[PDB]
């Protein structure tokens, strides 16, 4: 059955960005997914999206600017201390010049560079570059 609904959405906009498509429909929406997509959009990787209100759960139609190379989830959400952040971005990120790791911290969902700036650890959701 469908567990880890964010792993569905990140696989859908990975597989559609490879096919050169302009829009993806991901369903069901969630508030974790919307905060993940907002982090990607504010660094230029996706572009605007529209949440479609069914009364059951959402659907999101994401626009795709072809800048995304890879969008991934990390399952399970391991606890990441702030001293452990360098090993995670050594394993996951392709360069020290670009790419992001998305953490859920207690100050919100944010990328790994902002979490250092707020001096916070948390749990890892995924990564994009």
């Amino acid at each position: 059955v469908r567990m880890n609904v964010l792993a569905d959405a990140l696989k859908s906009i990975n597989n559609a960005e490879k096919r050169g498509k302009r829009q993806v429909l991901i369903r069901p929406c969630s508030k974790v997914i919307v905060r993940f997509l907002t982090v990607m959009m504010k660094h230029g990787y996706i572009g605007e999206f529209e949440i479609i209100d069914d009364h059951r759960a959402g659907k999101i139609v994401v626009n795709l600017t072809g800048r995304l190379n890879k969008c991934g989830v990390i399952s399970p959400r391991f606890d990441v201390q702030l001293k452990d952040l360098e090993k995670w971005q050594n394993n996951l990120l392709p360069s020290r010049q670009f790419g992001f790791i998305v953490l859920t911290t207690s100050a919100g969902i944010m990328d790994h560079e902002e979490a250092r700036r707020k001096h916070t650890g948390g749990k890892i959701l995924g990564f994009f570059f």
Partner: protein, 186 residues
């Protein structure tokens, strides 16, 4: 006619309660109007020049206003100038309980008294004679959202001119950007 919780009326409330007891004494709606009461009133500025009145009714008396609302809005607009009147229930929003709260939180808050449920029910009754047949939320490139509300086409010419006051009202008492559309078919 104006029965607040803090128990002090004001100038618009007096001028609206008088206009409502006028309908209690001349029009044929006395059987409905003698049972009801309002709770607050405001006048906000929309569109740079247009004005709008926000009647506040109690939520147990909400559906009784909605049987007679279309015969109320034009007749109130005749007594005033061109000023679109809007009826909105008076709903509490109990705050989200945290790890640092008070012991007035003894029983769990009902889901109707949440912020999402109140903002999505305020959106239901201010557009009253039409229905909401669909919502889209557009998240723009600066992180800001913009709600699009598709209204019913069967009451299009009734409230087509009101949609620039509706958005200003919902920006006033909620704080959100809303556009109102009319789809050709569902």
């Amino acid at each position: 006619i104006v029965k607040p919780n803090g128990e002090k009326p004001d100038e618009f409330e007096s001028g609206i309660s008088q206009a409502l007891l006028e309908l209690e004494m001349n029009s044929d709606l006395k059987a409905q109007l003698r049972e009801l009461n309002i709770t607050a009133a405001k006048e906000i500025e929309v569109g740079g020049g247009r004005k709008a009145i926000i009647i506040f009714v109690p939520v147990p008396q909400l559906k009784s206003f909605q049987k007679i609302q279309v015969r109320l809005v034009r007749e109130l607009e005749k007594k005033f100038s061109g000023k679109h009147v809007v009826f909105i229930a008076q709903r509490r929003i109990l705050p989200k309980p945290t790890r640092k709260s008070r012991t007035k939180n003894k029983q769990k808050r009902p889901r109707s008294r949440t912020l999402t449920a109140v903002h999505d029910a305020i959106l239901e009754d201010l557009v009253f004679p039409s229905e909401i047949v669909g919502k889209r939320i557009r998240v723009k490139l600066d992180g800001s959202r913009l709600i699009k509300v598709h209204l019913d086409k069967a009451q299009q010419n009734n409230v087509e001119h009101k949609v620039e006051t509706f958005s200003g009202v919902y920006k006033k008492l909620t704080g959100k950007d809303v556009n109102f559309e009319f789809p050709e078919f569902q």
